[PDB]
């Protein structure tokens, strides 16, 4: 039942209890809900959220690096195969030329 | 109800209790809210916040380094391909020249 029992209901119950005994409630720290404003977030939680975001971004970057290096290895293998074929062709051509 | 029950309300409640028994309250450590000022932050929390900021910045720098090295690998592969093509062209030209 916590979701239904919000701040306003708790304040109303406390005010009823006070009216039963403490007729006056606004005289002290107790603040009417009308003038209440949400607390300002603290820097600690903000920086913790930023650190979590940075960590998840780092995980994503690591995955991106994995895929990128896989692609780089594929490209390097293809280039090596092409260069080997070209070198073989050049060697055959030179051999034939010198034999002629 | 903690957000509504601020410092002023707590001080007012304590003052009411004292007036019920301890008519005089300002005679000792108790300080009127008018003259109260927020406590000065301690160096420990400041340096902890600085360390957290440094750590998140280091995470961001690690991500930047990952992307930068990925780009560097791409550029190196492109340069290697271009140099291989140029070397093949030069070898073919030299072979044709010497055969002629």
Numbering used by the authors:
A (entry chain A), B (entry chain A): 549 to 648
How does the study describe this entry?
Escherichia coli phage SU10 belongs to the genus Kuravirus from the class Caudoviricetes of phages with short non-contractile tails. In contrast to other short-tailed phages, the tails of Kuraviruses elongate upon cell attachment. After binding to the host, SU10 tail, nozzle proteins, and short fibers re-arrange to form a nozzle that extends the tail.
The wing domain is the largest, and is formed by eight helices and a β-sandwich containing two β-sheets of five and three antiparallel β-strands. The positively charged side-chains of Lys3 and Lys5 from the wing domain interact with the DNA that wraps around the portal complex. The two lysines are repeated twelve times in the portal complex, and thus form a high-avidity interface that is likely to bind DNA soon after the genome packaging is initiated. Anchoring the DNA end to the portal would influence the packaging of the genome into the head and its final structure. However, the tunnel loops in the SU10 virion and genome release intermediate have the same structure, therefore it is likely that a different mechanism ensures the genome retention of SU10. The clip domain of the portal complex reaches out from the capsid and enables the attachment of the adaptor proteins.
